[PDB]
Amino acid sequence: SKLSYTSFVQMVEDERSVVSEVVIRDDGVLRVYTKDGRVYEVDAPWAVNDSQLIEKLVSKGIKVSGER
Amino acid sequence: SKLSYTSFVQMVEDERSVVSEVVIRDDGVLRVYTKDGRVYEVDAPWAVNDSQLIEKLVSKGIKVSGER
Amino acid sequence: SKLSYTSFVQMVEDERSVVSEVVIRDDGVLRVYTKDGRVYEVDAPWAVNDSQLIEKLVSKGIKVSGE
Amino acid sequence: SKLSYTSFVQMVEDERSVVSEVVIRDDGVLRVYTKDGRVYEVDAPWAVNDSQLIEKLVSKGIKVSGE
Amino acid sequence: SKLSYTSFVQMVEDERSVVSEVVIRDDGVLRVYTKDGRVYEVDAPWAVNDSQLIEKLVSKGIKVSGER
Amino acid sequence: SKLSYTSFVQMVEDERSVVSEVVIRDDGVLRVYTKDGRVYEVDAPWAVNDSQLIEKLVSKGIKVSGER
């Protein structure tokens, strides 16, 4: 399902965050997996080198995986 | 309607911001929507790299998405 | 053989880290050697030229090199 | 046998956690069982009645109980 | 060496933080070890149940150990 | 000099705070020092539990220490 960048950040920040995995594709799309078994596509080429976002995901224990 | 990046940035940082949505297109054009039903086009191929900008948008709850 | 960036960072941070050595390839695939003799590949282009990661590895006693 | 609170939390967070079960004693010593058959004691009185820790353990599939 | 609570927090927050270990004693004293091989005593009974401080130390990779 | 906890709290939260140091004694007395060379005693056995207070002090760079 298409998911906006804002809504993606909203999901990450949720105190009961449902985000299990973020796959950072080399084409600038993030595939975002939830603990309830959904997957979303976020078109966000700016995110792929955003170290602040990445270490935030990691610190939350969200699985971060590159893809090519 | 045409809008300079310079003006866009101030529209964003304005506490009374009229901005409701920003689409960052891969051709370097930003489509900027306002609360009052206007849409603007901003030519700014550098905007994908303006981390301060995009985090700022999301922090204010503005809908940000990428397009291609 | 594939290892997530998250699990990589956890392994680096571990109080008893099993990480021996990391090679940061220009293509953004890290090769990660562990003390148990295993080797992993971490797809993480954001890690290339990440000074903070490099300093972290060095500070943990992990051997780090590039190409 | 002694395990730091930091290493305990790392083990709980690990993408491939080896933690099977935690017993939160009233005296603030946690007993931590790992899948490799080891048992650790974590001196952490702050963990008693820590709802956030309890929810975290449960969410990671780790068995948690008190006395 | 005696170390104030403020100075302790100062050491934790240092971007090149020299703190390696904090032992939280049941008597309300923190023993604080540095990477350069010093040890400090911080009289701070309020710290021992401060979950915000504790998870902050843990998130930094500082070794946190209870003592009795 | 005698000082109520009520007044102490406002002295702390004051943006023009005169407070330079606070000693939290285990007998429940706070010794409060000001920039102009005054010292006050505050009877407040609950102060060791006022997390908002102590973090506030440290965030403003006030020297906080425990005594016994």
Side-chain angles (χ1 to χ4, degrees), chain E residues 49-61:
Chain E
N49 50 28
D50 179 352
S51 65
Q52 193 167 328
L53 170 68
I54 294 165
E55 300 299 328
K56 174 181 167 177
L57 295 174
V58 172
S59 74
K60 292 182 54 65

Side-chain angles (χ1 to χ4, degrees), chain B residues 6-17 19 52-53 56-57 60 62:
Chain B
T6 334
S7 290
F8 167 62
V9 166
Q10 188 51 233
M11 287 175 68
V12 168
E13 303 194 310
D14 193 348
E15 223 170 70
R16 210 177 296 262
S17 176
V19 182
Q52 176 179 8
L53 183 83
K56 171 67 145 137
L57 296 170
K60 297 178 75 175
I62 297 165

Side-chain angles (χ1 to χ4, degrees), chain D residues 27-49:
Chain D
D27 74 357
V29 180
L30 319 183
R31 175 166 268 163
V32 180
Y33 298 81
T34 53
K35 300 176 193 249
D36 55 18
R38 296 288 301 272
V39 177
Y40 301 96
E41 313 298 318
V42 179
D43 187 334
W46 51 88
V48 184
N49 301 137

